[PDB]
Each structure stands twice: as C-alpha cells, then as structure tokens.
C-alpha cells in the first residue's frame, strides 16, 4: 500500500587483501647503507626505490654473514609486493651512545588493497540496483548522486558500482565518510575495555553479542590457541613431507607458499598463549581466515591436511579446522561490534562523533526526495567503521526495530544500510509518506568452508533485510534529530 519514492543507501567497500607486515633488525653494512646516511626513520614507497632495495637483498643474500634466512623471505616479499600500491618499508635506526647507527629495523608493510574479487562484488551490486531502479521508476536513474571517502579501496568500490549502475560522478566527502582521530581514539579506549573481557573469568554479563551455547570467553580463547598450535604443527609436518609448490594450481595477488607461510607463522606466534591473545589481534586472525578460505582454499586444505588414515574441508579429519573457524567467528562477533562502544553511551558517543554528519545528510536527501516530485537515489561509499556507528545511532534513537542489534549478521564487505522513502497510498489525497529501513550484510557467508567458489574467489552479496516497517517520515526524522 506504499509507492516507492526514493532511496538513501550507504555501502561498505568490497573485498580487500589483509594488511601484513614483516619486522626484523639487521646490523650488516649493506643494510645500514640503505638509510642513505639518514639517522631517523626513512619511508620508501617509490617503486624505483623499492627496486633498489630489492637488489640489496639479492646482494645481502650472496653473503651469509648476515642472516640469509631473513634475506630470502624479505627479498621475495619485496619483489612480489613492491608492484602493489601501499607496499612500503619503514627503517627505524637504533643509535648507540655515540650517535652511531649500529642496527636498522627493517619493517616491510603491504596488503590492504582491494582484491581482484572487489570489482565483481561492486559490479554485480551496481547492475542489480540499475535493474531494481529501472523497474520502480526510470526517472530515478536520472537523479543519482554518489559520494566516497578518500581511501582508495572505498573509491574503488564506488567507481565499479557506479560503472555497473550505468566529470567525476563520485564526489569525495572527507567530512562525512572519512575517519576522525578523536573517535578512533575513543574506539581504542573501548579496545582497552575489551582486554579484560577475554581475560580472567568474565561471563559476558550483558548481551555482549555472545552465543549462550559458548563457554566463558576465556575458555573459548584458550581452545582457539590449542587449535592454532595444532594446525601449525600440521603445517610444519606437511611442509616437511609434501611438495608445497604443488598444493594449489592458482595463486592470485602475487601470493605463493612462502607468503602464505608468513601470514600464519605470525598468527601462530600471536595465538600460542591464551593468556596473551590480544583482542585487536582476534580480528586479525578472522580476516586472514576469510581471505584464504576465499583465495587459497586449495593450498589451505593440503597444507593443513592431517593426512590419510591408511577436495573439501568436510571430513572428520578436518574437524579440528572447522571448530577453529567457528571459535574464531564467535570471538570476532564478540569483539569487533564492541570496538565501536561497549555501553549504549559509548556506542552512542562513538556513534555521533563518527557519523553525525552522515546522519544529517541522509535526512536531507529524504527531504529532497519528498519535496521533489521526481524520485531519486543517493549512494554513500564509506569504510566499515561508519556502518557500525551509524547503525548504533539508529538503535540508540529508540526507533522500533524489526531485528535486534545482537541478531544482526556481520557487517561484511558491501554491507548496506538503506533509507527507502515511499508514499502512503490511500483513497484520500496528501499521502503521509513513509520511511522503511533495510540492511544487507554484504558479501558474507555462514559456511566459508562449504561455499562453492569460482576461480574469481568471489562471494555473492546477501539481499537486504528490513530493519523496520513503513514508518512515518516526520517520526523517523524526530527520533534521529
Ligand atoms: Zn583470489
């Protein structure tokens, strides 16, 4: 009994590669010479300079006086990832009592780029929106307005979505879609509140987005470490016995078995002591699990295959792995939502400091759509943080909800929040108009180890679900402001 009139949709960026960093210190003169005489931190991101550094590793490897083992991994890492935007080196010198550089800290950082699957996710979404729009009212395509944050991965999703939907049509708005240092500090302080939750014997007293079936967070964290120590030994055994270069026929993003080993070697180090697991590193583990389960399932299966008794993770042999996945999901679903505030006031305070501008703009867009007889649509592409915080504003506004905050699925890549505007169709004029809120968790799956994947390593987007029913326009604007 309602005719569509407009949509304000906020969309999260598409799939991206995990951020990764290798750290070690060297004292050999060849390593010190790379500083070019500088006695402070030096950052190298020019591809020309990265090639120069790369050659140094080949020369340093010729001489085993230094640590050749670290040179071997670093050289491959540098050459594979120096071709990627965002790959960088940080050189932190260490000065002795005579202001002489005796050793330099070599930090190689890379990752965080949108995967080759990102274009497909955004492209599919843009086409669907064009399809849906061309069926409701073709004039809406004539009234599309797109914004994006400054981050490359966000604009990347915005660009491909806009191309698929159809002079930069995307208008970068830092004030609305970009992060603020004040709020990120608050999220960090909330992060400091998360450390005790996993330690000692807390029993998630409030909802804390925690499954009732699961034991204490300190018991769950303890079991995960046991599984990690289990699989790392399986990995080592499989490295020692099997041909690792033949465990997967396809490698994307310039990855190879060595870089794969490095990701997990770091994670295994961070997940070898339950009483030391850092809550911020729980989110790190889960992100790597999604990536490999999407882009490196073949290698993942064989490198963690516990062997035969004597093409899928569905075996009692692979039971230790599925439980590890389930336990990681639980911990990720109990930490990440709470990084944006644990208490309603914190969830609210973080909610406003981050998404106060975006919330105002959405109301204005709906105001425009109502006053303008022509339906329209406005899309905002933002990072993951704004989605949670804006969602917090929605819940903390007291608006009647159709779905509980805890019951909401993970806000994965291409997660969407919609403010669909309609008209109240009756037999009397002057329709009262109505607003309906819907959400989509994006390209997310509940069974990463059972989903059938293509060579493109891509997951379809979950359809939107209604957070509310058709609610009075003026009423929805008053609750928010
Ligand atoms: Zn891939």
Author numbering: 536 to 701, 708 to 851, 918 to 1088
What does the paper say about this structure?
Inositol pyrophosphates (PP-InsPs) are eukaryotic nutrient messengers. The N-terminal kinase domain of diphosphoinositol pentakisphosphate kinase (PPIP5K) generates the messenger 1,5-InsP8, the C-terminal phosphatase domain catalyzes PP-InsP breakdown. The balance between kinase and phosphatase activities regulates 1,5-InsP8 levels. ScVip1PD is a phytase-like inositol 1-pyrophosphate histidine phosphatase with two conserved catalytic motifs.
